[PDB]
Symmetry: C2
Subunit: 607 residues, 2 copies
């Protein structure tokens, strides 16, 4: 029982999980031609399978802004950033976004150690194609040295966030993210780490990838993308970066963090010797799925949705279906009781982030309570008939009904269990089982009233960043339909889940409508207005000692907080004082919620 | 308690662990100038730290024959081999050599599964610099596509050997091998794998490595190699490949496999935020060593030898010594009771195989019962004084005396415990604790006599390979001073630890001297002679069904074996028959011993 308390990711035509969900439910094939920002793309295309390495050329899912970073926010020189892997940059940003989404600060995440916290980091990456530019430059002349060591992608994260736990970069073909989650979960069970950060990353920036994908017949001709049925003969590579935060279920419940799902079981293996290399083994797939389900203590009859490795390959889909059918028929002989689909039909093939993307899709589906359509499964493979299999491919958006079944003379309404599979080209295979979280009790004791008004504080490094942050908060309060009953939750998340920074903005509000009105008024260029607090921290330094080496001022702060006079405390917190927000809540701690993260800058940095 | 039952490795100026031990005990600095087979090496040298990337140029440990392979033995086309990573080739060869050394066949290693065996594979590799040639070719014109994915290094091994367990390639800077051993040991404890193969690999084949190592001030000026003391300011990179076979101690004892050592405990972590990147944290080092020793249940007072990360860096050695001193002073305040050294002063800096090389050095020292001299530690660092520390650097070959101490009023003669540390540049740190294996009882019941003569069988794929194998066996029987009391052990190892192949040679022998005489006579070109059996397997195929679909012949074989008439059974095993050698030994199973492995061919294959 390992809970998920935070997730983030950038995927093609989607900067956030919310945009990803919008594209998923709208059924959008977010796969287009290669941008001109990357290689010219006209040197290698020939429309025939002869020796150029292309002819599977203008089809790939790409994330906008791969060369965008805010190195200053991380205390990194521009000269260092220009030569640090974009995978590393993007993973660092995604980990920070995930930590912010979880409602935890780097200085209080797993911090129950006294020196910085025992947090593990696991990242799935296959290859680095950034130093290949250095090699090309060396061959042409000049001199340049980019080195790889994909361990940096996690070591830099652990160094910046000051984590004291294991930091390793696993590597299994097309299953690195699932293997990383496997290892992180086992570390959590053993107690090596109190909290973990698992994830994966992949970006396509050098044509060598496509050249190899064509030299080997792993490409997908002129088809738009993966097709789970009807004569699919390849897969379309895609970019993608993602991360998820893992904590034991009991600790998450006690701390009150919002939980997306629970990873009940996990498994990995290798197929072995087959009739050639890069040929999957249905027996091994069945065994790994079997062991995952046993470790999870789950009856397959209770499963409702399973995400498959997909790839639309001619000789991967029937084998995967056979393995699933064999490992499901052992216990139940019923048919057409489960749904099957893949996010690859939407976003392409990450090859390292495929597993994390599928996990994100499953979590979004389980949060919005709606099964999402698949793509290109209109006709289905003629080779295999789904009538005998227990799987029916989902084609349209539908309510994910809570399963109700009858086993062994007993009728029960089981929860929403789901499965995800990821099989590597080399032979490595991985599987995860997931289940939804059911809250025990849910009631806020009317904590908002004239006796205790809501305090809203936002901190950033500049004026533009603060403006973007407030814009995003307003847009979120609109698009996620937030109410005045989750005002204390927003206040707590913003108080003890966002680092204090140079520029600070604070207001006292009563209703959500008043909050929105004051935020819009601030967006309008007005200087002097009531209940508006704005300030810096570095312009003022003479009174730092005055309020740092004095305890009677702390007693005055306690008295003012008891009285409810938040105006002065905010007027001087916006300036410079450390403030324990936790003691503001004597008891009945409010839970955390998802809010927009820091709007990093978009500075360009390339060789 | 995880036992070691087999090891292999190729290191500079050493094709085998025996040559490695010879060079270690002789105190040989096996670090020389870059061979002309690799890059020209005269393009980048300038003797000054200005912009060419060299000026730390002609100093590195290299393994002879990095482009040598026997693809036919592995059923791989020459065209495939020319474009498969030399790291992958060398690791495959080393894994086969390790399995052969352990006295286990691929078809009987962890084979208690019914379909091929649940064996795990873990490999430590930092970077692949082989596709950089493809990039250079692309830039210059033409077209070529080598792709990396260092997971292949393990996936190919698992596919060839038909293993059904996890196969992953970890990546931590300069600690990948130790992290792999960590993960393999925990998998063994959890039961995911019954047997494991851990290892590491590194080869230097592209100048970009040295260019980066100079651009960053991680190089070692004009000094020959690492210097643990007296003004060392860098490290010298080196090539190296190695592997070790891991099994639980009880299973190894029951199966009778020879055991090198026992891994009592292991630990890994990350330093965190320090005063800059690539700066070690003594507190983190102390904590990881602490946790390793607790997991091992070992009192540091009982430790006798500890291998350090070394690297001779100006700002790594005092910090490592401080960490070790802090984590050792907690329990004991005594000084100069332990020895410290590094194999890096001999073989350079593997950066992925450093840990496996140190483990090999420790195992060889613990087998030959002799502490080996360090190198370049004549004067020692003036900054740190070893008088207060519990460590004295070993400078000459000496007997590794069994420690005898007095703790808490109780005097005891403890075993030979040892430690090994490996710290990464990024911040990842790892530590292992090792202890020797003490046999309970040791006596052969005079199993060799006229009533049961020794049977010696050797199989290879050709005549030249068989000739080399017999030459190596004779040279080994001479150089390891084997007697006539370990004739049954050799017979069993050769019978149930070597795959039957096309060319087979069999003899019946009584004394070791007679064995050597017959082998030498065979080396001499004679055709017809007594007690000599030679044959093929594929020239004869008509009687295969005759002896495969007949059981009365099996009864005749049993009767002949009972009678002791081995001549006919060998005369026809040399031809084609499967034979269960195990039933030849009714009881009192003989143990396995280390013998030379298959002499792979030296075919050259490069871009």
């Amino acid at each position: 029982d390992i809970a998920i308390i935070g997730i983030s990711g950038r995927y093609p035509q989607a900067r956030n999980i919310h945009d990803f969900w919008k594209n998923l439910r709208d059924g959008k094939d977010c796969i287009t031609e290669i941008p001109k920002d990357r290689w010219d793309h006209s040197l290698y295309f020939d429309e025939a399978k002869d020796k150029l390495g292309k002819s599977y050329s203008k089809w790939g899912g790409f994330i906008d802004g791969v060369d965008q970073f805010d190195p200053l926010f991380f205390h990194i020189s521009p000269r260092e950033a220009e030569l640090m892997d974009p995978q590393e940059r993007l993973f660092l940003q995604c980990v920070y976004e995930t930590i912010e989404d979880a409602g935890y600060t780097r200085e209080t995440l797993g911090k129950h150690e006294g020196l910085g916290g025992n947090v593990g980091v696991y990242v799935g990456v296959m290859y680095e194609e950034y130093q290949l530019y250095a090699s090309a430059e060396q061959a042409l002349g000049r001199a340049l040295a980019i080195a790889g060591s994909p361990a940096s992608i996690a070591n830099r994260v652990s160094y910046f966030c000051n984590f004291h736990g294991p930091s390793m970069a696993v590597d299994t073909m097309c299953s690195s993210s699932l293997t990383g989650i496997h290892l992180a979960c086992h570390s959590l069970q053993r107690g090596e780490c109190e909290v973990a950060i698992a994830g994966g990353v992949n970006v396509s920036i050098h044509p060598n990838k496509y050249l190899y994908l064509s030299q080997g017949k792993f490409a997908s001709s002129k088809g738009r993308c993966e097709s789970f049925g009807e004569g699919g003969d390849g897969y379309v590579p895609g970019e993608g970066v993602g991360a998820v935060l893992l904590k034991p279920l009991a600790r998450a419940i006690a701390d009150g963090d919002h939980i997306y799902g629970v990873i009940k079981g996990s498994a990995i293996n290798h197929g072995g010797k087959t009739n050639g290399y890069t040929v999957p083994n249905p027996h091994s797939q069945s065994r790994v799925i079997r062991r995952a389900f046993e470790e999870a203590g789950i009856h397959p009859r209770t499963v409702s949705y399973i995400e498959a490795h997909g790839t639309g390959t001619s000789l991967g889909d029937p084998i995967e279906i056979a393995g699933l059918t064999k490992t499901f028929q052992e216990y139940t002989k019923e048919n057409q009781f489960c749904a099957i689909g893949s996010a690859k039909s939407n976003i392409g093939h990450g090859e390292s982030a495929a597993g994390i993307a599928g996990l994100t899709k499953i979590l979004l589906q389980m949060k919005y309570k709606r099964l999402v359509p698949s793509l290109h499964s209109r006709t289905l493979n003629p080779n295999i008939d789904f009538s005998k299999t227990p799987f029916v491919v989902q084609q349209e958006l539908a309510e994910w009904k809570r399963p109700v079944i009858e086993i062994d003379g007993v009728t029960r309404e089981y929860a929403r269990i789901a499965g995800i599979s990821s099989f590597g080209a080399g032979g490595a295979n991985a599987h995860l089982v997931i289940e939804e979280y059911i809250e025990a009790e849910h009631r806020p004791p009317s904590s908002i009233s004239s006796k205790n008004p809501a305090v809203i504080v936002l901190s950033a490094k500049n004026k533009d960043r603060l403006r973007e942050q407030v814009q995003r908060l307003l847009s979120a309060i609109r698009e996620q339909v937030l109410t005045d009953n989750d005002l204390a939750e927003i206040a707590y998340t913003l108080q003890v889940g966002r680092e204090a920074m140079e520029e600070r903005f604070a207001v006292i509000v009563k209703s959500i409508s008043e909050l929105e009105a004051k935020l819009t008024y601030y967006l309008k260029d007005e200087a002097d207005s009531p209940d508006l607090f704005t300030g810096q921290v570095k312009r003022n330094k003479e009174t730092m000692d005055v309020f740092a080496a004095d305890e009677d001022l702390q007693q005055a702060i306690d008295t003012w907080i008891t009285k409810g006079k938040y105006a002065k405390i905010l007027q001087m917190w916006v300036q410079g004082l450390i403030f324990d927000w936790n003691k503001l809540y004597g008891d009945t701690k409010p839970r955390r919620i998802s809010l927009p993260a820091y709007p990093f800058a978009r500075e360009r940095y390339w060789l």
